[PDB]
Amino acid sequence: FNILLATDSYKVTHYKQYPPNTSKVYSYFECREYEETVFYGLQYILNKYLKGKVVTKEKIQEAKDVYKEHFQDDVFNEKGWNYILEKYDGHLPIEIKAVPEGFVIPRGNVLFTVENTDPECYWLTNWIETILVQSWYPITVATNSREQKKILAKYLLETSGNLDGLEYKLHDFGYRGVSSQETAGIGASAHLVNFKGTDTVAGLALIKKYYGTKDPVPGYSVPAAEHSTITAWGKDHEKDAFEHIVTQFSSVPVSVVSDSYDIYNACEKIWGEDLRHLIVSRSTQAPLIIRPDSGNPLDTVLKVLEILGKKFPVTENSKGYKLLPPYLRVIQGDGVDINTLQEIVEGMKQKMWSIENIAFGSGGGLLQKLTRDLLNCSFKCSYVVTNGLGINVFKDPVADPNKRSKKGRLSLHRTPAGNFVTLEEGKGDLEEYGQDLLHTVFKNGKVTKSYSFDEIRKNAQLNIE
Amino acid sequence: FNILLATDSYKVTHYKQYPPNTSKVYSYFECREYEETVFYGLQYILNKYLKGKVVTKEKIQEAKDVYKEHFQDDVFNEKGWNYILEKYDGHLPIEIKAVPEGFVIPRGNVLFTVENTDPECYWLTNWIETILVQSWYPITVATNSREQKKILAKYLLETSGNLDGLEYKLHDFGYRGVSSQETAGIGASAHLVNFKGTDTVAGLALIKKYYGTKDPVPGYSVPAAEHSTITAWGKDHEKDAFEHIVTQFSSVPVSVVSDSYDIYNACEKIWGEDLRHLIVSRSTQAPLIIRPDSGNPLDTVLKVLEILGKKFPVTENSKGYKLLPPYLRVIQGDGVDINTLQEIVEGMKQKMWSIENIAFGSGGGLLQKLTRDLLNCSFKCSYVVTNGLGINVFKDPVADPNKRSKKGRLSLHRTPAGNFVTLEEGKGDLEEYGQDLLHTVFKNGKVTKSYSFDEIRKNAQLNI
Ligand SMILES: O=C(/C=C/c1cccnc1)NCCCCC1CCN(C(=O)c2ccccc2)CC1
Ligand SMILES: O=C(/C=C/c1cccnc1)NCCCCC1CCN(C(=O)c2ccccc2)CC1
């Protein structure tokens, strides 16, 4: 990895574009006015990419060589990068301030700020815009996950009277449906801020290396079947596959995909009649979890439940809702995103089925079907010093007021009612509001303030009680 | 990187689930059921992740230790992975066949197949599903970018006489808009299959390392402003910023974002009146490229062109379409995806503006606004041998016929009309449809067949 090759091409040319006699470029990050976001992921970037000796003589040559061919021109700030190497032993002369990781903050608020600590390195602040803005992803995944936990919480509490097992109600299936290996790790870590169940293994090693937990691992899974693991038996021997798998895993929770050929047959005849004897003998700590995987998600879940309720002993009510026997549960893992999750739980409630009956799995919707536009994650310059004189700067495009950016030196404060407010124009310097809620997390090549994953999870809790 | 920790956790438990006495698991990849896809990206994966000694005693132990806590149990197949280490010096006993990279293939065709080459390693075929399926991404980016080149080609050809400058008409802006550094490299590389213009400076090193070009680099850029380099001058000094930037870059092409405060004022008064003398003096080798960056993408572009054609000398084409003077162009890099790209070029054509006047930039739309559902990229088992007998294997869910998978030994063939067909059930073994078009690209830890990025580009060319 070469930090000199980890920016937008045009930013290689920006040092020649700022006003001459500019000693400071100050920039901030916001989710431009999902009315509330989880700040997560910066610490990963600081450690992996920005910390320590990130500039060497070889990295300067490498970049020089590439940019020459790439631009067909000698645009590249070799002098500027040599200065960092010579004066700071290749450590970035940058200070970053940030709200604690895990903090849940309404949109339109400053989440972190970036400025150079050396007047020569004025160009450096926005060189690292590209890398830092990619924090949009862990933030958006953590936020979207939490918002889905909010819906589950609402309906679990309503139908059941509590929240038992909530943190296992959305399972991460997103590993293969993601753009890369690195994305898998970052994204599965963000989901684990809210839940404890994951099939995306990459996230466990990221967390332990960059954040850490008191617990040996932040995430957990159970034995589960695949379509290959059923279909390999031959279409006439689906029952032999089912029987073999529940028996191999008789003592632990086991999930078995049941829609290879006909899910409704599989539930009514195979599980409900042929193999019922192997199911009803199962421990409460080791349910069979039937996994539908196709058809309309709502329509299929409801039909699966109606089938099963008539083949197995249903109890009712502490809230009036119906509950499968303890050794039998369902997991819906196809076509689940924030939109369809809400339609499924609402449809179940309408049909008198408790949310304690179901868990969800999500792949693409959970990790890949997200974009920087969702929360309008943006990084903009708000303050510059030119000729020893500070000015408050901003953009304000005529045709789009929603793209207007903040002015001057910023700070994040607690309001009298206990909410959040960003102060602009250096106004935080007055003592009218609180202490600044942002902390220096990186300065001159060193991470100066760290958070464990246990603190992050704590910070990102839902209110309910 | 540890390949024992690079799978869906449930696949850790799959070796216990296949029928006893299974010696062969044979699986394939398809874009199930955007009628044609560019096959790109597998080679990166083979080289980065699957080739060489991928298994060590340390990697086995690490995986053992993680999975013990992850499952709260001992389900990890230590014995199976130790057999690889001992027998094959940590090299995977797997064979993969694949269509040549860059190949443009209709949906529903086999693109690659995977099978184990040792009976002991029957569970290994689908262990590497997860990693291989991430192919969906370079394939989907390459396909979507090509589709966008098709639209541009159609409209450039119609409004001007030709396709001059086509390969520079969609610029990659997506570096900050993707999920990671690795994603940036993969995705920008995939866009470069179709175009030469990029600001995503991670795709170049990927291409040189895994694919290679004859030219020093596969992608190019020019000097350009961002809002910070305009806005830092102060609101009242936007003209000073413009003048400074174009003077610093007066002999090369330069893009200048002009919507910091008022895009329409900047074009008509600042570029069109105040600084006109610095624009009209520019070389044809070095146009000023005005960059709008907000508002309705089509309404903005059209008003931008109208403004400018009335401040600068416009010429009318051999096709009847209007053309800015050679030192002035436009790049629209906000809200551009395949849908809005089409609407802009059509709206331009309707108002008699040639596509030679414009280039596009695209960020999240080009590299992030994509899913595995778009082309239905899917890896499925189609053939197994158990107790010495091979059986054709498949799923066929009652409520979704579009999820049905292919049966038995698969093969890709050329039809009598010169099209593609996938033959199932080992029927390719009959000499009826000629030679199998898939090539062995990986076998027993070695890459056996590979392609230059120059070959890939050539394969991915448009008919036009
Ligand atoms: O099925 C898959 C993975 C599928 C997959 C993975 C990757 C790619 N493609 C497909 N994994 C099985 C995970 C189950 C985890 C927990 C066990 C404990 N649990 C209940 O006991 C339960 C309580 C109440 C309601 C339901 C269940 C809640 C769910
Ligand atoms: O504006 C940006 C980058 C913006 C950005 C990057 C990253 C993130 N956010 C924003 N870059 C300048 C790109 C120009 C590249 C080529 C030069 C040659 N060229 C024409 O001469 C031309 C011919 C016909 C029509 C138009 C132009 C075609 C376009």
DSSP-assigned letters across all residues of A5-60: GSSBGGGGGGGGTSPTTEEEEEEEEEE----EEE---HHHHIIIIISS----HHHH
Give the mutation candidate from A144, A180, A244 for the B interface (greatest B CB count, under 10 A). Answer: A180
State the angle between helix axes of B338-350 and B297-309 in degrees (0 to 180), rounded to the nearest 10. 30
Is the C-alpha dihedral spanning A289, A290, A295, A299 positive or negative? negative
Say yes or no for a CB contact (<8 Å) between A130 and B262. no
Radius of gyration over every alpha carbon of chain A, rounded to an integer in angstroms = 26
How do the domains of chain B map onto residue ranges? 1-133+372-450, 134-371+451-464
Q: Which residues of chain B are within 8 Å of residue A228 when distances are taken between CB atoms?
A: 14, 18, 25, 27, 126, 380-381, 393
Q: What Cα–Cα distance (Å) separates residue A451 from each residue in A49, A296, A456, A459?
A: 17, 42, 7, 11
CB B219 within 8 Å of CB B198: yes
With a 6 Å cutoff on the Cβ, whether A223 touches ligand 1 is no
Please state, as a whole number, how many other Cβ atoms lie within 10 Å of the Cβ of residue A445. 19
In words, the CATH class of domain A134-371+451-465 is alpha beta
Nearest to A425 by CA among A387, A378, A390, A376: A390
Q: Give me the long-range contacts of B313-317 (CB less than 8 A, separation at least 24).
A: B317/B159, B317/B160, B317/B161, B317/B354
Query: In Å, how far from its chain's centre is CA A120?
Result: 36
Q: Which atom of ligand 1 is nearest to the CA of A357?
A: 25
- Vertex A130: Cα angle to A132 and A444 (nearest 5): 50
**CA–CA separation, A49 vs B160, rounded Å?**
46
Say yes or no for a CB contact (<8 Å) between A69 and B264. no
**CA–CA separation, A14 vs B183, rounded Å?**
25
**CA–CA separation, B232 vs B234, rounded Å?**
6
Q: Give me the long-range contacts of A428-434 (CB less than 8 A, separation at least 24).
A: none
Resolution in A: 2.1
In the reported structure, the alpha carbon of residue A198 is separated from the centroid of ligand 1 by a whole-number distance in angstroms of: 9
- Greatest Cα pair distance in chain B: 84
From the number of C-beta atoms within 10 Å of its C-beta (0-12, 13-18, 19+), residue A71 rates as buried
**CA–CA separation, B272 vs B464, rounded Å?**
37
Query: In Å, how far from its chain's centre is CA A128?
Result: 21
Query: In Å, how far from its chain's centre is CA A304?
Result: 31
Any A CB within 8 A of B220 CB: yes
Q: Which residues of chain B are within 8 Å of residue A300 when distances are taken between CB atoms?
A: 399
With a 6 Å cutoff on the Cβ, whether A185 touches ligand 1 is no
From the number of C-beta atoms within 10 Å of its C-beta (0-12, 13-18, 19+), residue B284 rates as exposed
Which among B177, B182, B381 has the least Cβ separation from residue A183? B182
**CA–CA separation, B160 vs B177, rounded Å?**
33
Say yes or no for a CB contact (<8 Å) between B397 and A293. yes
CB B144 within 8 Å of CB B126: no
Q: Which residues contact A388 (CB under 8 A, 6 or more apart)?
A: A23
Q: What Cα–Cα distance (Å) separates residue A238 from each residue in A255, B23, B136?
A: 15, 20, 30
Say yes or no for a CB contact (<8 Å) between B399 and A296. yes
| Residue with CA closest to ligand 1 atom 6 | A173
Q: Which residues contact B147 (CB under 8 A, 6 or more apart)?
A: B34, B338
Q: Is A317 left (phi over 0), alpha (psi -120 to 50) or beta?
A: left
**CA–CA separation, B360 vs A403, rounded Å?**
20
Any A CB within 8 A of B204 CB: yes
Any B CB within 8 A of A14 CB: yes
Which two structure tokens, joined as six digits, stand for B390?
Answer: 């091979």
Q: Which atom of ligand 2 is nearest to the CA of B358?
A: 25
Residues 363-422 of chain B whose Cβ lies under 8 A from any Cβ of chain A: 363-364, 368-373, 379-381, 384, 386, 391, 393-400, 403, 405
Residues of chain A immediately before an interruption (C to N > 2.5 Å): 33
- Vertex A370: Cα angle to A110 and A293 (nearest 5): 145
CB A195 within 8 Å of CB A168: yes
Mutate to test the pocket of ligand 2, among B166, B199, B285 (most ligand atoms within 8 A of CB): B199
**CA–CA separation, A216 vs A211, rounded Å?**
13
Which two structure tokens, joined as six digits, stand for B124?
Answer: 């290994």
CATH number of this structure's domain B134-371+451-464, picked from the four choices 3.40.190.10, 3.20.20.70, 3.40.47.10, 3.50.30.50: 3.20.20.70
With a 6 Å cutoff on the Cβ, whether B225 touches ligand 2 is no
Say yes or no for a CB contact (<8 Å) between B262 and A397. yes
Which two structure tokens, joined as six digits, stand for A321?
Answer: 């809702």
Which two structure tokens, joined as six digits, stand for A325?
Answer: 């026997």
Say yes or no for a CB contact (<8 Å) between B181 and A13. no
Helix/strand/coil for B288:
strand
Any B CB within 8 A of A73 CB: yes
With a 6 Å cutoff on the Cβ, whether A168 touches ligand 1 is yes
- Vertex A192: Cα angle to A190 and A196 (nearest 5): 170
Residue A172 pairs with which residues in a beta bridge?
A198, A362
Say yes or no for a CB contact (<8 Å) between B179 and A181. no
Q: Which ligand is closest in space to the CA of residue B354?
A: 2
Q: Which residues contact B96 (CB under 8 A, 6 or more apart)?
A: B42, B46, B112, B113, B114, B440, B441, B442, B443
Which two structure tokens, joined as six digits, stand for A39?
Answer: 């700040």
With a 6 Å cutoff on the Cβ, whether A462 touches ligand 1 is no
Say yes or no for a CB contact (<8 Å) between B182 and A181. yes
Which two structure tokens, joined as six digits, stand for B189?
Answer: 């590389």
Mutate to test the pocket of ligand 2, among B176, B229, B289, B328 (most ligand atoms within 8 A of CB): B289
